[PDB]
Amino acid sequence: MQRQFTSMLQPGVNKFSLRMFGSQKAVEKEQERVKTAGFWIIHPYSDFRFYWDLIMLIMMVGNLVIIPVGITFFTEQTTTPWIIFNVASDTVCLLDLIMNFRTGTVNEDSSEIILDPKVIKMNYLKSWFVVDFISSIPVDYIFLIVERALRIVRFTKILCLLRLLRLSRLIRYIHQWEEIFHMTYDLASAVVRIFNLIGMMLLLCHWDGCLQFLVPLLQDFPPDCWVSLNEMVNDSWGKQYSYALFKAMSHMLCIGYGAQAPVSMSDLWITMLSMIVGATCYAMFVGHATALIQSLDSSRRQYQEKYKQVEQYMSFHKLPADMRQKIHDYYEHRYQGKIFDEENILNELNDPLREEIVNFNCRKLVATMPLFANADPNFVTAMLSKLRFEVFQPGDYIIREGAVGKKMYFIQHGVAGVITKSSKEMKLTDGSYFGEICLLTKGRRTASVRADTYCRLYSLSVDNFNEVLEEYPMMRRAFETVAIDRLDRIGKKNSILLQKFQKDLNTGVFNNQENEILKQIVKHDREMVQA
Amino acid sequence: MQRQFTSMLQPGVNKFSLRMFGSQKAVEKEQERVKTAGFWIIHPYSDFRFYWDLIMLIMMVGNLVIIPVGITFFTEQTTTPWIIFNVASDTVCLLDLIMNFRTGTVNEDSSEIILDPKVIKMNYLKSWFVVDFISSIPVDYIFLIVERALRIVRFTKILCLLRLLRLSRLIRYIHQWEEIFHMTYDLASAVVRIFNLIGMMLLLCHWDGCLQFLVPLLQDFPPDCWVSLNEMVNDSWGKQYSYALFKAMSHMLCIGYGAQAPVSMSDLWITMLSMIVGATCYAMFVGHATALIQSLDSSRRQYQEKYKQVEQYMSFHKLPADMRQKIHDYYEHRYQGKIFDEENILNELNDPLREEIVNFNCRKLVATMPLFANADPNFVTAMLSKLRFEVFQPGDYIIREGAVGKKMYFIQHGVAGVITKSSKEMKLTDGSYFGEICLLTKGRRTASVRADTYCRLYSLSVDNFNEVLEEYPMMRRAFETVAIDRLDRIGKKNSILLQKFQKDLNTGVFNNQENEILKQIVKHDREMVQA
Amino acid sequence: MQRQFTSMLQPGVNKFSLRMFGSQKAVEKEQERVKTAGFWIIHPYSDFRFYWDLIMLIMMVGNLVIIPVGITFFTEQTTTPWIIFNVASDTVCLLDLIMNFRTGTVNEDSSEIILDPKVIKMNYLKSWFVVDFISSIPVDYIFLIVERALRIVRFTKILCLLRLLRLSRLIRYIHQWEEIFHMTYDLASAVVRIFNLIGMMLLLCHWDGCLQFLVPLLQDFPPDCWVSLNEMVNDSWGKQYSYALFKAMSHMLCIGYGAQAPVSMSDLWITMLSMIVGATCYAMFVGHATALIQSLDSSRRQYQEKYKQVEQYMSFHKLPADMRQKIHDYYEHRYQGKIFDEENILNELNDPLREEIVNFNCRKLVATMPLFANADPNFVTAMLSKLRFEVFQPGDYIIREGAVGKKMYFIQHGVAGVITKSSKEMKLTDGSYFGEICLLTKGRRTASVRADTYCRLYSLSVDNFNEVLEEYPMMRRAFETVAIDRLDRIGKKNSILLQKFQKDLNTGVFNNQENEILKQIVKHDREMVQA
Ligand SMILES: Nc1ncnc2c1ncn2[C@@H]1O[C@@H]2COP(=O)(O)O[C@H]2[C@H]1O
Ligand SMILES: Nc1ncnc2c1ncn2[C@@H]1O[C@@H]2COP(=O)(O)O[C@H]2[C@H]1O
Ligand SMILES: Nc1ncnc2c1ncn2[C@@H]1O[C@@H]2COP(=O)(O)O[C@H]2[C@H]1O
Ligand SMILES: [Hg+2]
Ligand SMILES: [Hg+2]
Ligand SMILES: [Hg+2]
């Protein structure tokens, strides 16, 4: 009852209300501000106002369709459907006139003033009251009591379009909804938009044909108008309307005239005006179609543009053909036909979303790799936030022996081969890491690592490595243990790292459980290398 | 009198003058340079020249409309309006010829040379004097005294279009004004531009129809021209002009011919030429309409493109559906359907504008938060310039206990919950800050902070924090006091911070008023937490 | 046999399979997962499914072409080609109906579920089974046994288009292939795309003309239809079809009607509908043509835009004309009409590709320059990765004497002149370097270096220089030796560097072979300067 009424009048919490007023607490405060009126008032964001604008829109469309047909072909309409439609439109327009008093205006620059007592009424009386009044003047059944004549009277109903001109915030909300829909579905959105355009053009053709038959009627059908020429002055209204609409549509779409070219001044000038209007609207239609298509094929176009820029670079530097093919298939394997700026996206997001994304991306790595499978989640999240994606092609040398290292790698996909001066070549696969002994000893690379298949790795710089491990030293002890074991395995040895770990162990800092965990890690690594 | 004359001739201070000559002092110097002439001279930026170009434009439009109609349908015109229009156009063209002497040219590469005595006269005598002279030759009433004939004479008046070709700087100023208008109003600008295009095309149709009726007239209406075919050789000039314009417009908009297809060579070739011209101009019209629409829907298109790139990223990484929905609603709540680069904007602005903007943005924070409500404005502006906006979703963990902290947060909207190992959970709301104890003690986070509703915060890094507080130490004392109180409240204690503050207090650096203010701050914080 | 069958059903390793499933090991795992069915099943990426979709596409095109002609002009077809085509289409549609059971669906969000036993059958029974069944219902030869009539029956065959609506993954693969082709060949791609569009429009014209002749046939040719008006009710089917297609095509391309304008209600409304459809499709065609052209001229447009921005900058700063010409010819010589972001490209690539590219770019430098011609490849690759391209114009001063230096240069093309206070001017050419004595002594520049012709150099910063040389000191000794020799040559001397090298030599760190190599380097440099 009154509770539902007040709820309808008060701005309901919705996505549009949140977008316009920030927090939900502000929505509650605005509900309270509406409550401060005491006298009934509808908020420009009320669901009641939304539904009312909806029914007013459907009534305006019905009127736009029906008014010209009546004016032209129906002199007097006293049948049931005509009377009920006229009275329905009259009462609806009057109710809208009334309710436009208690409507809170919404000015720009974040200006929304209820101003129930006087400001809204005064602004409406000064702005648009007279046109809505003459619209709401009832059907000619009341004008005959107050005072071709009928055809002259009904003209006053053409200005009901101004209500549709005012009804635009609902149009903007519908445009937002349709934009969401278009981003969701591609082809359906195109179909809907082109059908909307076709509907607009068809309504214009309707009005044009109505006018083209109306004007020869206001002159009692002179002997040289197209009606008297085609001798269809006595045909039923169906044929007359059909042929008039045909003439109007042929003038719009630039097909031709009707039977023949005009011969009288009246229909001559009407034909010229209709030709101008139709040509302009068809140009607008072509423009909208071009815009729709160009918006449809955006991503493919951007991909082609990036590809062309890469081609221009390779051409400017005059690279060999095989190298160009290598660059192209590398791009194909890295981006897989897609285009985006991952750095910009990750910068736009926030910390919890980035953590969620990297955890989902490296779920399998966290599951398989032992250190992550047993470490504290804060350290895991730090490492995963510091990682960075990379792709390597078969035969490429990921690490060259002797050089200075500045990053380590975590394998996500593929197989990598480790080659030394000895014949012992060891092949790592998913869930294993390499290139950390250089980062742990500050020396040079101790072995060469070459990609055997297409490898997909996650590299970690040396600065981030040192930062994270300075924040967590026990993981550094674990890394050093695994690295010493690997070095002992290949047949080389780093006395610096060995003596450092031996001193740390003799210092008694580690516990029995600690060295047990370290033995578990080294066993797991031995298994992962043997497999 | 002479004062107003000199003021009109001298470049008036306006937005265009400022844009062209930098400082207002340069405008005064150019006024002086004009004064150095001694002989009267109009500056190419004078309001007098502006008004003169305006009236010359309206006269050129009147001539473009009237000349062909006269030439074609009016053999001799001795009535009052015709005579007055001819003499008006003649005197106006002659006055423009005269005033083009004392006009200072404006070359490119910042070249504006008054050069009153000789250079302007010589350049005009060498450039365009003869065509303007033959234009300014008076109406045929003087040519008959000097020496179909009339129709041959009036041709000399067609070259008045060259004056309109010269009048282009006023066109550029009008284009600037219309660009401002178009940036201001959207739909009105589109209506104005399409009406301008339609007017151009209609003027072309006018000239085309005039020619199409003129040529059969110069041949005494042969029996096979369209005029003699339609037997309208004797009709009043109204009907002839109407039907000729109809033929021209049907040829342009590609509807058809007139009554029937041409049958004679003359009108055959004229029809082909008119068809070519009309098709070209309609193609140009379609192009302009497409450009206008595509410029109308720019921002929506850019928003759609960014959304599509985010979608492509999420697809390349194969994220779950709920995570994709979370990303999308986060974007919706962060940007609210708008698109801009805040970093680039703030980099484009300057320091006072940035200070103004951040002060307006954080007005409520400065009002509510006690430290800012009592501190020195320089410190307040430093902090507000260092802040950075952020958005969090409900349930997200803003701060996880035990981790290392690198920023603090100031709440602008929403509610945040503080959870510890104890059951004491404390809820902060607008105007409160958290996450500073880690920055003050260089330890770890002492509690977990989780967003309860959609939170909108302003984060401050640790480097900027330390910089600002090294510039202002008393605020650091206040922060430390509030932090010690909060720690004591939750039930934990940091002996390092406690002993540091105790030593600073025993050092006698603080005053009675100082500790009074600190007690006020701690009381206000207790109230803000209790509420 | 069965081996080839299982191979066809299992997803073959291809570029699309790799793009959809990452590593080849995943492709093998999916082959195994298909093997887990036990009951035969085709994978949505099987080459068998590809070939089947191909033959179904050709059958659908044949049906789209043949069905309307039959329905309209061929009452009963009992000849050999008609019967064989009908039975072929029937069996093909039935086989597709059958095979759509064992087809694994492919949902979005990385969802590919074989689900052989029940899920696929249930989903197909709930989704699209009935329409495919009524399609697969055989030709009317079976419907007559089961129960104008013929023309009523064959309508059931129009819904075979739904199969073409389903066949879209093959369309996407063909679109990928055509995108590769379009990136490869420019003009051929445009020709193919416009021919595709023309084919679509022609098929639509075909259906439209078929309908336009069909409707007057279903009414026994009333006396006022266009057929009875043109008296072609008795002509052979060739002429009737030709004239109907002519009417439809004239309605689409907006030429006109047929003989004359319609006179009856039926063909009146059919003409209006056909006009609407044709205008819409021609608008779509114009849109696609505009998009194709705009995609064709992309790179030229981007180059023009960058040029215009440079022009706007130079205009805003009001630079002289000769300076503007200098800027423009510098741009012409630096980028050579091409446009790309080398930094972004090199950031997108990886380390081995970057090493390959820089090695190919500086091959001649490595060949000619002695230090690189004798040094270790790791040092060479470090230097080449640190270098950076630069271009200088004739007369420009590359290095001014006395100033502080922050980079050295390696000449790739051109000649440079070295000027001192003495008259000894020495000219360096390709393969020589300069500007290292400042970097080695931390003093000031010891001579001026001016470009004589258009120079193309590779500059190396001072930080990278010091980093690389701290990683490799012997090369620093070589640089110092060459620099001391050059200084002694010009007539100046740096006692600091001289004494440092003398102390290093007296320290006995160098070997006989080492100083032999150094003598070789200094001899080679003397030769390169003398030449
Ligand atoms: N036995 C081994 N098994 C697996 N990986 C190894 C082995 N020995 C060395 N590596 C890795 O190969 C890398 C080569 O360079 P680094 O010495 O920087 O670090 C080395 C380790 O990451
Ligand atoms: N009693 C409290 N009331 C409000 N906020 C608190 C309280 N105790 C701790 N906090 C905040 O919670 C944060 C958790 O991490 P920090 O220790 O970095 O800094 C802490 C303070 O900002
Ligand atoms: N005799 C020479 N031959 C070639 N180049 C020289 C000679 N003397 C000096 N240079 C170069 O000219 C440079 C001028 O500045 P720098 O002293 O930094 O380093 C100097 C050398 O690179
Ligand atoms: Hg109305
Ligand atoms: Hg003139
Ligand atoms: Hg079929």
PDB file of N, CA and C in Angstrom, chain B residues 174-207:
ATOM      1  N   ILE B 174      35.287  31.227 -37.926  1.00  0.00           N
ATOM      2  CA  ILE B 174      33.961  30.642 -37.757  1.00  0.00           C
ATOM      3  C   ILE B 174      34.073  29.147 -37.493  1.00  0.00           C
ATOM      4  N   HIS B 175      35.056  28.489 -38.108  1.00  0.00           N
ATOM      5  CA  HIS B 175      35.264  27.065 -37.864  1.00  0.00           C
ATOM      6  C   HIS B 175      35.729  26.814 -36.435  1.00  0.00           C
ATOM      7  N   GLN B 176      36.591  27.685 -35.907  1.00  0.00           N
ATOM      8  CA  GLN B 176      36.990  27.586 -34.504  1.00  0.00           C
ATOM      9  C   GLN B 176      35.790  27.756 -33.579  1.00  0.00           C
ATOM     10  N   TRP B 177      34.968  28.772 -33.848  1.00  0.00           N
ATOM     11  CA  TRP B 177      33.779  28.996 -33.031  1.00  0.00           C
ATOM     12  C   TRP B 177      32.832  27.802 -33.102  1.00  0.00           C
ATOM     13  N   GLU B 178      32.645  27.245 -34.300  1.00  0.00           N
ATOM     14  CA  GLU B 178      31.771  26.092 -34.462  1.00  0.00           C
ATOM     15  C   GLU B 178      32.362  24.845 -33.822  1.00  0.00           C
ATOM     16  N   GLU B 179      33.690  24.743 -33.754  1.00  0.00           N
ATOM     17  CA  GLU B 179      34.305  23.622 -33.054  1.00  0.00           C
ATOM     18  C   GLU B 179      34.063  23.720 -31.556  1.00  0.00           C
ATOM     19  N   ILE B 180      34.192  24.925 -30.995  1.00  0.00           N
ATOM     20  CA  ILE B 180      33.828  25.126 -29.593  1.00  0.00           C
ATOM     21  C   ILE B 180      32.368  24.748 -29.369  1.00  0.00           C
ATOM     22  N   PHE B 181      31.485  25.221 -30.252  1.00  0.00           N
ATOM     23  CA  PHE B 181      30.062  24.916 -30.138  1.00  0.00           C
ATOM     24  C   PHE B 181      29.802  23.414 -30.217  1.00  0.00           C
ATOM     25  N   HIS B 182      30.502  22.719 -31.116  1.00  0.00           N
ATOM     26  CA  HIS B 182      30.297  21.285 -31.290  1.00  0.00           C
ATOM     27  C   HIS B 182      30.800  20.506 -30.085  1.00  0.00           C
ATOM     28  N   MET B 183      31.925  20.931 -29.509  1.00  0.00           N
ATOM     29  CA  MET B 183      32.379  20.320 -28.270  1.00  0.00           C
ATOM     30  C   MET B 183      31.394  20.576 -27.136  1.00  0.00           C
ATOM     31  N   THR B 184      30.713  21.723 -27.157  1.00  0.00           N
ATOM     32  CA  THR B 184      29.738  22.024 -26.113  1.00  0.00           C
ATOM     33  C   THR B 184      28.453  21.225 -26.308  1.00  0.00           C
ATOM     34  N   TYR B 185      27.762  21.444 -27.424  1.00  0.00           N
ATOM     35  CA  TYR B 185      26.485  20.797 -27.709  1.00  0.00           C
ATOM     36  C   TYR B 185      26.694  19.720 -28.765  1.00  0.00           C
ATOM     37  N   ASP B 186      26.081  18.553 -28.553  1.00  0.00           N
ATOM     38  CA  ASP B 186      26.307  17.431 -29.459  1.00  0.00           C
ATOM     39  C   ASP B 186      25.322  17.434 -30.622  1.00  0.00           C
ATOM     40  N   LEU B 187      24.025  17.344 -30.332  1.00  0.00           N
ATOM     41  CA  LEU B 187      23.009  17.174 -31.369  1.00  0.00           C
ATOM     42  C   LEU B 187      22.831  18.436 -32.211  1.00  0.00           C
ATOM     43  N   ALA B 188      22.868  19.601 -31.568  1.00  0.00           N
ATOM     44  CA  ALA B 188      22.717  20.865 -32.275  1.00  0.00           C
ATOM     45  C   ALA B 188      23.841  21.042 -33.285  1.00  0.00           C
ATOM     46  N   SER B 189      25.057  20.642 -32.908  1.00  0.00           N
ATOM     47  CA  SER B 189      26.185  20.744 -33.825  1.00  0.00           C
ATOM     48  C   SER B 189      25.985  19.860 -35.048  1.00  0.00           C
ATOM     49  N   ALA B 190      25.509  18.632 -34.838  1.00  0.00           N
ATOM     50  CA  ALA B 190      25.232  17.743 -35.960  1.00  0.00           C
ATOM     51  C   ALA B 190      24.173  18.340 -36.874  1.00  0.00           C
ATOM     52  N   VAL B 191      23.108  18.886 -36.285  1.00  0.00           N
ATOM     53  CA  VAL B 191      22.048  19.490 -37.089  1.00  0.00           C
ATOM     54  C   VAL B 191      22.600  20.645 -37.917  1.00  0.00           C
ATOM     55  N   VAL B 192      23.418  21.501 -37.301  1.00  0.00           N
ATOM     56  CA  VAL B 192      23.970  22.648 -38.018  1.00  0.00           C
ATOM     57  C   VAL B 192      24.867  22.189 -39.161  1.00  0.00           C
ATOM     58  N   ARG B 193      25.713  21.187 -38.912  1.00  0.00           N
ATOM     59  CA  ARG B 193      26.644  20.752 -39.948  1.00  0.00           C
ATOM     60  C   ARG B 193      25.912  20.093 -41.113  1.00  0.00           C
ATOM     61  N   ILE B 194      24.913  19.256 -40.820  1.00  0.00           N
ATOM     62  CA  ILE B 194      24.178  18.630 -41.913  1.00  0.00           C
ATOM     63  C   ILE B 194      23.360  19.664 -42.674  1.00  0.00           C
ATOM     64  N   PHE B 195      22.866  20.703 -41.994  1.00  0.00           N
ATOM     65  CA  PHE B 195      22.151  21.754 -42.708  1.00  0.00           C
ATOM     66  C   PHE B 195      23.092  22.545 -43.605  1.00  0.00           C
ATOM     67  N   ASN B 196      24.329  22.767 -43.155  1.00  0.00           N
ATOM     68  CA  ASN B 196      25.321  23.420 -44.003  1.00  0.00           C
ATOM     69  C   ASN B 196      25.586  22.601 -45.262  1.00  0.00           C
ATOM     70  N   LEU B 197      25.773  21.289 -45.098  1.00  0.00           N
ATOM     71  CA  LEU B 197      25.999  20.426 -46.257  1.00  0.00           C
ATOM     72  C   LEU B 197      24.809  20.459 -47.212  1.00  0.00           C
ATOM     73  N   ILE B 198      23.595  20.364 -46.666  1.00  0.00           N
ATOM     74  CA  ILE B 198      22.400  20.393 -47.503  1.00  0.00           C
ATOM     75  C   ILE B 198      22.297  21.720 -48.242  1.00  0.00           C
ATOM     76  N   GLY B 199      22.668  22.818 -47.583  1.00  0.00           N
ATOM     77  CA  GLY B 199      22.640  24.108 -48.251  1.00  0.00           C
ATOM     78  C   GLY B 199      23.611  24.184 -49.410  1.00  0.00           C
ATOM     79  N   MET B 200      24.825  23.661 -49.218  1.00  0.00           N
ATOM     80  CA  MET B 200      25.785  23.619 -50.320  1.00  0.00           C
ATOM     81  C   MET B 200      25.233  22.819 -51.496  1.00  0.00           C
ATOM     82  N   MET B 201      24.721  21.617 -51.218  1.00  0.00           N
ATOM     83  CA  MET B 201      24.190  20.783 -52.292  1.00  0.00           C
ATOM     84  C   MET B 201      23.011  21.454 -52.984  1.00  0.00           C
ATOM     85  N   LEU B 202      22.184  22.177 -52.228  1.00  0.00           N
ATOM     86  CA  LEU B 202      21.033  22.840 -52.828  1.00  0.00           C
ATOM     87  C   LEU B 202      21.465  23.989 -53.723  1.00  0.00           C
ATOM     88  N   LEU B 203      22.487  24.740 -53.310  1.00  0.00           N
ATOM     89  CA  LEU B 203      23.015  25.788 -54.174  1.00  0.00           C
ATOM     90  C   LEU B 203      23.557  25.201 -55.471  1.00  0.00           C
ATOM     91  N   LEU B 204      24.225  24.050 -55.377  1.00  0.00           N
ATOM     92  CA  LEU B 204      24.718  23.409 -56.591  1.00  0.00           C
ATOM     93  C   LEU B 204      23.571  22.968 -57.492  1.00  0.00           C
ATOM     94  N   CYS B 205      22.521  22.382 -56.909  1.00  0.00           N
ATOM     95  CA  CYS B 205      21.338  22.031 -57.691  1.00  0.00           C
ATOM     96  C   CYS B 205      20.756  23.256 -58.377  1.00  0.00           C
ATOM     97  N   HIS B 206      20.755  24.391 -57.679  1.00  0.00           N
ATOM     98  CA  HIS B 206      20.251  25.634 -58.250  1.00  0.00           C
ATOM     99  C   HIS B 206      21.026  26.008 -59.505  1.00  0.00           C
ATOM    100  N   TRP B 207      22.354  26.048 -59.395  1.00  0.00           N
ATOM    101  CA  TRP B 207      23.169  26.402 -60.556  1.00  0.00           C
ATOM    102  C   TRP B 207      22.988  25.396 -61.687  1.00  0.00           C
TER     103      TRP B 207
END
